[PDB]
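Thread: Modeling a multi-component assembly for a lab meeting

Hi all, long-time lurker, first post. My supervisor asked me to bring a structural picture of a complex we are working on to next week's group meeting, and I have zero experience with this. I have the sequence lines for every component (330 residues in total). Could someone generate the structure of the whole assembly? Inputs are pasted exactly as I received them:
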Amino acid sequence: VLRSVNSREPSQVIFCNRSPRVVLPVWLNFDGEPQPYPTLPPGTGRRIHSYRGHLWLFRDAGTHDGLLVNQTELFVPSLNVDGQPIFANITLPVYTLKERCLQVVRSLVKPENYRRLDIVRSLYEDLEDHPNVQKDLERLT
Amino acid sequence: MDVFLMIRRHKTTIFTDAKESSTVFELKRIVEGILKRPPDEQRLYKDDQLLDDGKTLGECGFTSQTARPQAPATVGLAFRADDTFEALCIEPFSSPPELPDVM
Amino acid sequence: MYVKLISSDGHEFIVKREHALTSGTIKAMLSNEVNFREIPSHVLSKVCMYFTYKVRYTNSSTEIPEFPIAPEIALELLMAANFLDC
Ligand SMILES: CC(=O)N[C@@H](C)C(=O)N1C[C@H](O)C[C@H]1C(=S)NCc1ccc(-c2scnc2C)cc1
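Re: Modeling a multi-component assembly
Sure thing. I ran the full set together rather than chain by chain. Output:
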């Protein structure tokens, strides 16, 4: 359902990582499968060649937390005008305090050890439910 | 250029904001509205260092990149006990527990 | 317009009304003072910073910085977040 259109009409883009995270760009291919691409260190940028009507999204390369691109989840390259690339400005979202706390707990405690933490079972399940590109795609449907 | 502050006296903490170009006197007027004490019965500090009424917040080292929403800077506050000013006292927050073995 | 948020250990945090309504649990408790019997000051001060952070950077075109959490407060802060629904 969610997938790139095979246009064969080129589009130059600037992937600009304006976040503290190492970023993993993910292209949704012609069957809607997520293909991962080379990472971008925090504060860096790359000029890259894509095509019109291609679907892209962006994640933390280590933990897979979701990130925004021009204030939204999906980015679609469009027609260039006056030799000017399109900017894909990648940023952190305003995470909920709860979700942000979960990220920090995950980074310190191994999945084996989540059950040993002194918390309600509601939070065990929340911890275990890792961020995932496949899950996010099924929501959009 | 906004700045974000914790104005602190005893066990009171006021979360508020201002500009780098704001004066210290404007911080006292904010305190007056909340705690009902006039500017001349207040005394504001950056650590030990007293802040005069005419000084802007930028001059005294409160900048938009240091005094942030998620990590606001502290301004000390001391009231005048009718005759004379009390010593600056700010109660510390509670202590977090020891990290478990699994962290 | 301000509201007083009070920790278990007696600290009185004064924050703007609109910032405190970020938490739905607080929205319910009010609709001027609120007392939290289970949240100590080193946790509750962080909650108050999160409110400020959310109101500044929500629907913002600028770069957004990380909201930091020291490892020593994470477990306690998580449980406050879950209770407060923020
Ligand atoms: C006929 C067609 O459209 N083929 C696809 C496979 C294609 O050429 N694509 C899919 C995406 O629209 C991008 C484009 C490719 S594979 N461009 C080359 C490219 C290589 C590396 C990058 C990246 S991503 C982060 N760093 C780099 C260097 C970006 C684009």
